[PDB]
RNA sequence: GUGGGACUGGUGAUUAGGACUAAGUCGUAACAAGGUAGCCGUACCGGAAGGUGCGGCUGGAUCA
RNA sequence: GUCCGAACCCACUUCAGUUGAAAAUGGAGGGGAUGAGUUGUGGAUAGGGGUGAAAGGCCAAUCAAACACCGUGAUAGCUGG
RNA sequence: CAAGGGUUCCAGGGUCAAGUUUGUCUGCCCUGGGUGAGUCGGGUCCUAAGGCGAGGCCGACAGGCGUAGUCGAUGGGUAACCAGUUGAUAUUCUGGUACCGGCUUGUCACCGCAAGCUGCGGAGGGACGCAGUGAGGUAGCUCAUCCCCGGUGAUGGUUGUCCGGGGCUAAGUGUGUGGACUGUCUGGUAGGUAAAUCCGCUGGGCGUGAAGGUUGAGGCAUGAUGGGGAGCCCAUGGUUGUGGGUGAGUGAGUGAUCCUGUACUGUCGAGAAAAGCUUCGUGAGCGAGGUGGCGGGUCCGCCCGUACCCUAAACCGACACUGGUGGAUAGGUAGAGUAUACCGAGGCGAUCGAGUGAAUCGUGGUGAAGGAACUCGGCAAAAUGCCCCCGUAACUUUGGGAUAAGGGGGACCUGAGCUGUCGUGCACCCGUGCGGUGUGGUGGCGGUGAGGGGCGCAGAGUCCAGGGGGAAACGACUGUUUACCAAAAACACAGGUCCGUGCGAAGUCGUAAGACGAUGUAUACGGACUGACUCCUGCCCGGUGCUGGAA
RNA sequence: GUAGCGAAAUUCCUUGUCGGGUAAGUUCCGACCUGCACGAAUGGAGUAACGAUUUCCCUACUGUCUCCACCAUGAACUCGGUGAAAUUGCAUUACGAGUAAAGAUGCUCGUUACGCGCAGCAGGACGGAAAGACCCCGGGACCUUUACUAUAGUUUGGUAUU
């Protein structure tokens, strides 16, 4: 859930924080961590390619199993539910019944002690992983593979959810959390249930410092720049862009998806609109 | 106040050292040009 | 004596509505099915009465 | 990203300096001072490029396009000789 | 100390130059000399960021990137301390006492498809945040009628506790007090690149309700019959050191930034890697029936640095420049304090002077009466200032506003009782031979003190140390910015909305490969504008742009 | 052009008008609307808290002032030592009224003035320092755009790969 902070100080006034009720362990599994040095948004050429990235608390990467099909038929106990700084979801530490320990995105509702499993003959329970041909139509899943064997790629963030709506032929139709209707191979795997920590979006950070140690550098809007720095720059006093809205590199606002690629597998566009 | 030159032998050797100059073809041509001029110090 | 409060009267540019008076101007909202039945709470809108939505009432009625 | 306040970081006011002690400081006060803090070492990004909590700021004491060399004895209806 | 400098260090000779003056002097000149490590700091070991990169992929050429690897400290790992000595060096030399790795040797014990060694990896371990409180200690400090070594005072007193000084010793080893850690015995086993008897995951039996075992803050013992430590000696040699003459080592108070301690508690923002190390096997070779273990002895232990300056006259600033420069140590009294005042350890008197009541400029000081009449403006200054106690408004997002405002007390003498701690001692549990425990002690030291009293103009008596209240505009806020005329109302900001993006994402760097985005997956990411919060955010799609459509 | 707001960081006229504050208020705070030329995310109107921000007021307080005086110091000043600097066509370099490239130490007519130093003050030498930035003219640079001409990129179809 969310715990609201009291307005003792400014910057703490309207802010809030998760209460971490679902965490059962305040430390990570040492054998599943790797170093994750920060990039600062810099390319292999050393230049900033993604802006507004830098600083923040040090983090260690947790190795998450997005495949789950190399342990088919081996039951696992959910040993722990714990915090992952690298994502908005929680991670379930699983003890497979052969000694192997692993991490998964924690599905909503699963807790310490429940038994997960993978395979075509796996039971339909949240946390179980099955092929889409075996997942029944109308099921809410997550961690969905685009291409069979490629690993989980869709529906992974906190509260994410994918709806399996049809299984015609060798394609399964899924509604993604964007609302877009997509066709994927029936052999693609998916995990039953939706992602937990669904209420994290309501967190009010209330403080520039909290994003600063979340790793977000300040954002300078282009309209207060100089004309050399941004197409919106220039002007005496406060102005608009002096033109239609554009990117810092002069690209006008508009659709940017490549119209010729895997569009033959997209049923309907996300339809954000308004 | 704090001035422009703040010495550091390791940084100097990594920047203008002989091996640094030999690493790239521009630096090798610089060494050749200094040899033609007759400098006693080909590099730092 | 000094200081900070409490309560309270007069007054106040400006401003608000109430009452009464031309036998003023603008519409006709209600009373008959008042010409869109009226009214209650609420919401928004409109020079003004009022208009409309939602739920309710008969202190309305048609047709039985 | 609480309060008062040293170190530390800053640079608001004032006076002095302004051929200075100093090519930006000193005296007196002043802001921050557990934080978006500060600092050491090493490293990365390079010139129509970098970086910029954005002032066209900064990039080796003069940056609306660094410095060095080269084209080069550039050109100048202009000034001087 | 580090960085940086590079002989400036020491001794002797010198006074052209240099030194903001002089100079017999010097960080200057000349000559000679000076830096000693198995343990200190680096290398021989390990990796981070990052660099390079066999093949390789990419690119007209030049080149870009990157695999296997290989480098790269600012981190990990790693065995020594005290004393003494020189004109110049010292965890380096010398003395004393240790430790680590080799080689070799003596002795005891043990192995044998089946020793071992070396490679190779598995696992364990190394291994990690921030904030805070408390407890047990020690360093240090203070005091002393106690112990030592002195003193008996130029001027009234000063032979009793009156005055001055001192009251010390390391690493290592042993011990095991606090504290901490820890059930035990077998079985199985989809995993750990090849394997595993070492790990992980699981099944049983037994199990105190802790008891042992393991560990190790300090203490004690040892190291240490040693080392260090004052004034008395025929004498020394007269700014000197020699041989004897070293005397003491107790107790209490106070108390850390250190130790237990990566402890404990809280907490979200969720806090390197690799090797050494322990153990496990064997995807490799070596290797003989020889090795590997436990106490004892001999020899071997490499390279670089080591002088000197270093909050500076030696470094960065052209200077022997009121500037800048990272880290460690940092005592006493007053004090909350690492502020400030005066002092200690120790170091300095500053690198032109001597005078002289000129105006004037700078820097401080005081001021009658008045008190902002000054002035663009209360600019500058003054006042206020500390602790304890009382008390405190509009408004408010209920947190604030607030140190609001506005008051009282403070130091000195004496001082009843109350307390912290220790104490010879009483009895007692004693597992005693425990390095203990609970009662319990006239007292010492320290803290605190109601009351009473003294003196002065003045008791936060010096230094130090908010003025306050009312109202409006702007920005919510803490922050950021024009290094060197603008710190702001500008930027950022949390929050908000819109647009893009289904992942080889969009976007961005690049010719490309690639890379960032992200080891992220629409509760995400990128772009745009707005800028906490409250109440709101109207009408217009004709123009332009965007989106869709295609007669 | 709605809510809201309005002589406002926006109001030219303008010190608008009225009201408060002062003995006196072009500023200030509250109103009016006649909005030269407010207005709703380039957000509208508010807002506790915050501010080395801007503005007005009260109090305290003072050398800010009436109106300055005095004290001590680092320079100044004298002596000894050491010893620069910018500047410089020249020199035995007065004033007055004139005159002149229209602002004279230097020319005219007059007036005054012994030679040389020391400490001072700043009216002039159109004083020194910087080949005026303002202006214009020539050149350049960067910036902008529905200026021109091109181009990376993005996109269309053909064709090769097929
Ligand atoms: Mg491990
Ligand atoms: Mg590169
Ligand atoms: Mg961004
Ligand atoms: Mg992240
Ligand atoms: Mg700007
Ligand atoms: Mg542009
Ligand atoms: Mg613009
Ligand atoms: Mg404008
Ligand atoms: Mg430099
Ligand atoms: Mg009235
Ligand atoms: Mg009617
Ligand atoms: Mg009607
Ligand atoms: Mg209507
Ligand atoms: Mg603070
Ligand atoms: Mg500093
Ligand atoms: Mg300034
Ligand atoms: Mg000045
Ligand atoms: Mg503050
Ligand atoms: Mg570099
Ligand atoms: Mg500008
Ligand atoms: Mg510069
Ligand atoms: Mg150019
Ligand atoms: Mg630029
Ligand atoms: Mg030519
Ligand atoms: Mg020419
Ligand atoms: Mg000329
Ligand atoms: Mg040296
Ligand atoms: Mg010499
Ligand atoms: Mg020398
Ligand atoms: Mg010397
Ligand atoms: Mg001399
Ligand atoms: Mg000499
Ligand atoms: Mg000498
Ligand atoms: Mg090696
Ligand atoms: Mg690397
Ligand atoms: Mg090659
Ligand atoms: Mg290696
Ligand atoms: Mg190395
Ligand atoms: Mg020495
Ligand atoms: Mg020594
Ligand atoms: Mg020795
Ligand atoms: Mg390992
Ligand atoms: Mg870790
Ligand atoms: Mg006497
Ligand atoms: Mg004593
Ligand atoms: Mg196995
Ligand atoms: Mg295997
Ligand atoms: Mg203690
Ligand atoms: Mg040495
Ligand atoms: Mg030394
Ligand atoms: Mg020193
Ligand atoms: Mg100096
Ligand atoms: Mg120097
Ligand atoms: Mg004290
Ligand atoms: Mg001090
Ligand atoms: Mg001394
Ligand atoms: Mg010294
Ligand atoms: Mg000097
Ligand atoms: Mg004099
Ligand atoms: Mg005074
Ligand atoms: Mg007096
Ligand atoms: Mg006076
Ligand atoms: Mg008086
Ligand atoms: Mg007064
Ligand atoms: Mg006045
Ligand atoms: Mg006046
Ligand atoms: Mg002032
Ligand atoms: Mg003052
Ligand atoms: Mg208060
Ligand atoms: Mg008060
Ligand atoms: Mg008393
Ligand atoms: Mg008093
Ligand atoms: Mg004090
Ligand atoms: Mg207002
Ligand atoms: Mg105003
Ligand atoms: Mg602000
Ligand atoms: Mg704000
Ligand atoms: Mg601020
Ligand atoms: Mg900065
Ligand atoms: Mg500045
Ligand atoms: Mg945002
Ligand atoms: Mg892309
Ligand atoms: Mg990537
Ligand atoms: Mg804005
Ligand atoms: Mg239209
Ligand atoms: Mg339109
Ligand atoms: Mg179109
Ligand atoms: Mg007016
Ligand atoms: Mg006006
Ligand atoms: Mg008036
Ligand atoms: Mg609108
Ligand atoms: Mg707008
Ligand atoms: Mg506007
Ligand atoms: Mg705004
Ligand atoms: Mg506003
Ligand atoms: Mg306000
Ligand atoms: Mg400010
Ligand atoms: Mg007054
Ligand atoms: Mg003097
Ligand atoms: Mg003289
Ligand atoms: Mg004339
Ligand atoms: Mg004349
Ligand atoms: Mg004349
Ligand atoms: Mg003449
Ligand atoms: Mg004179
Ligand atoms: Mg003079
Ligand atoms: Mg003059
Ligand atoms: Mg001039
Ligand atoms: Mg100028
Ligand atoms: Mg000119
Ligand atoms: Mg100029
Ligand atoms: Mg041009
Ligand atoms: Mg230029
Ligand atoms: Mg094509
Ligand atoms: Mg084609």
| Alpha-carbon distances of A26 from A20, A31, A37, A107, B9, rounded to whole Å | 10, 15, 22, 19, 46
Distance A206 CA to ligand 41 centre (A): 66
Report if CB A21 to strand F is under 7 Å: no
CA of A253 relative to ligand 110 center, distance in Å? 51
Number of Cβ within a 10 Å radius of residue A225: 15
Q: Please tell me the distance from the alpha carbon of residue A231 to that of residue A238, in angstroms, as a whole number.
A: 15
Are the C-beta atoms of A38 and A54 separated by less than 8 Å? yes
CA of A8 to C1' of C7 (A): 36
Please indicate the experimental technique that yielded this structure.
Answer: cryo-EM
Q: Rounded to the nearest 5°, which phi and psi values hold at A83? A: -90, 135
Who contacts A50 (Cβ-Cβ below 8 Å, separation ≥6)? A41
Distance, CA of A153 to CA of A67 (rounded, Å): 10
- Listing DSSP states for chain A in one string gives -EEEPP-SSTTSSS-EEE--TT-B-SS--GGGEEE----TTB-TTSSBSS-SB------EEE---S--GGGTT--EEEEEEEE-TTSSSEEEEEEETTS-EEEEEPBTT--TT-EE-BSTT----TT-EEETTTSPTT-EEESEESSTTS-EEES-STT--EEEEE--TTEEEEE-TTS-EEEEETT-EEEES-BS-TTGGG-----HHHHHHHTB-----GGGS-TTT-TT---SSS---SSS-B-TT-PBSS--S-SSSSGGGEEE------
A55 close to A212: Cβ distance less than 8 angstroms: yes
Q: Among chain A residues 71 through 90, which have CB within 7 angstroms of nucleic chain E?
A: 73-75, 77, 79, 83, 85-89
Resolution (A): 2.8
Q: CB of A128 within 8 A of CB of A118?
A: yes
Distance spanning both ends of chain A, measured CA to CA: 29
Instruction: Write out the two tokens for A120.
Output: 């075509």
């Amino acid at each position: 859930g969310i715990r609201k902070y009291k307005p003792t100080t400014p910057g703490r006034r309207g802010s809030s924080v998760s209460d971490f009720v679902e965490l059962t362990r305040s430390t990570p599994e040492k054998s599943l961590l790797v170093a994750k040095p920060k990039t600062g948004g810099r390319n292999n050429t050393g230049r900033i390619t993604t802006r507004h990235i830098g600083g923040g608390h040090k983090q260690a990467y947790r190795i998450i199993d997005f495949k789950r099909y190399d342990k088919d038929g081996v039951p696992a106990k959910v040993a722990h539910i714990e915090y992952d700084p690298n994502r908005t979801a929680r991670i379930a530490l699983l003890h497979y019944a052969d000694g192997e320990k692993r991490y998964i995105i924690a599905p909503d509702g699963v807790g310490q002690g429940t038994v997960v499993v993978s395979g075509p003959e796996a039971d339909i329970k949240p946390g179980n992983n099955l092929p889409l041909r075996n997942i029944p139509v109308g099921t809410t899943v997550h961690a969905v593979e685009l291409r069979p064997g490629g690993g989980a790629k869709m529906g992974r963030s906190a509260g994410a959810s994918v709806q399996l709506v049809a299984r015609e032929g060798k394609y399964a139709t899924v509604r993604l959390p964007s609302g877009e209707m997509r066709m994927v191979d029936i052999r693609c795997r998916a995990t039953i249930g939706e992602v937990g920590n669904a209420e994290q979006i309501n967190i009010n950070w209330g403080k520039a410092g909290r994003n600063r140690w979340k790793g977000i550098r300040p954002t300078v809007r282009g309209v207060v720049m100089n004309p050399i720095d941004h197409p919106h720059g220039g002007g005496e006093g406060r102005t608009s862009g002096g033109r239609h809205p554009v990117s810092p590199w002069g690209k006008p606002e508009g659709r940017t998806r490549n119209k010729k690629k895997a569009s033959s597998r997209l049923i309907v566009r996300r339809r954000k609109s308004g | 106040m704090k001035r422009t030159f703040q010495p550091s032998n390791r940084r100097r050797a990594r920047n203008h050292g002989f091996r640094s100059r030999m690493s790239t073809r521009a630096g090798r041509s610089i060494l050749a040009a200094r040899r033609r001029k007759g400098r006693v110090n080909l590099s730092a």
